[PDB]
């Protein structure tokens, strides 16, 4: 049993016709203090998987090292390490899900919420969630923390069920993710403007975008708002 110290906020994601998108801001908060402004919380594993992590950053860095060590270990005595025996999203997830549930069962959890986004060998979209309790679930849209409350409603308007996935292009899906990140910047007190976004496509592969910024922000209406009720100046 511990308490999280340095923390990362929402990770958001969705499936589209040919793949998956995942995104997360670049902040490490120390309670209310916005302490570390350059923290990468999307961690790629090979060229077919991105693991997005929220919660405790020390435990994130531990998980990052486990995944790095997992790639090394898979390559050992494996002539097909960059081909038919490469790491799949489903393998990487199940490993993490095992660890998360084991750690909660020893009453010493890894204080995180994790989304594994990727594309499988057969082209199938992979998107699954796991957290500090070992609770797992999949859905066309997934989000952690504030993202669950705010991003999912917006992303579900694009992909409301399984049958909406083939009808959703990468442009529409990315647009929805970028809008969701702006909404979270308006409304989450432990979020930041700077974020990273990753697209894993079955045709074009892994596209990792760094140093994105929330833009086209509406603040102009603020000038007219005066007082808290009766004040006119």
């Amino acid at each position: 049993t511990q308490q999280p110290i340095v923390t990362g906020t929402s990770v958001i994601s969705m499936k589209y016709d040919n793949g998956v998108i995942i995104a997360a801001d670049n902040l490490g908060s120390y309670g209310s203090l916005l302490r570390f402004n350059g923290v990468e919380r999307l961690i790629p594993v090979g060229d077919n998987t991105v693991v997005g992590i929220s919660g405790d950053i020390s435990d994130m860095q531990h998980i990052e090292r486990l995944l790095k060590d997992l790639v090394t270990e898979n390559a050992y005595d494996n002539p097909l390490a960059d081909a038919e025996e490469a790491l799949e999203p489903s393998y990487i997830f199940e490993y993490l899900a095992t660890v998360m549930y084991q750690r909660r069962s020893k009453m010493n959890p890894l204080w995180n919420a994790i989304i594994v986004a990727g594309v499988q060998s057969n082209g199938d979209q992979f998107l699954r969630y796991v957290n500090l309790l070992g609770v797992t679930y999949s859905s066309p849209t997934l989000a952690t923390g504030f993202g669950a409350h705010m991003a999912n409603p917006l992303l579900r308007k694009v992909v409301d069920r399984e049958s909406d996935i083939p009808k959703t292009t990468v442009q529409v899906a990315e647009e929805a993710i970028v809008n969701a990140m702006r909404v979270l910047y308006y409304r989450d007190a432990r979020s930041s403007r700077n974020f990273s976004l990753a697209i894993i496509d079955k045709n074009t592969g892994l596209t990792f975008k760094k140093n994105l910024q929330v833009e086209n922000m509406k603040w102009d209406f603020a000038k007219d708002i005066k007082g808290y009720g009766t004040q006119k100046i």
Binding site: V6, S58, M60
Partner: peptide, 8 residues
Amino acid sequence: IPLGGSVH
């Protein structure tokens, strides 16, 4: 290295 044991 803050309280959690993270590195930056």
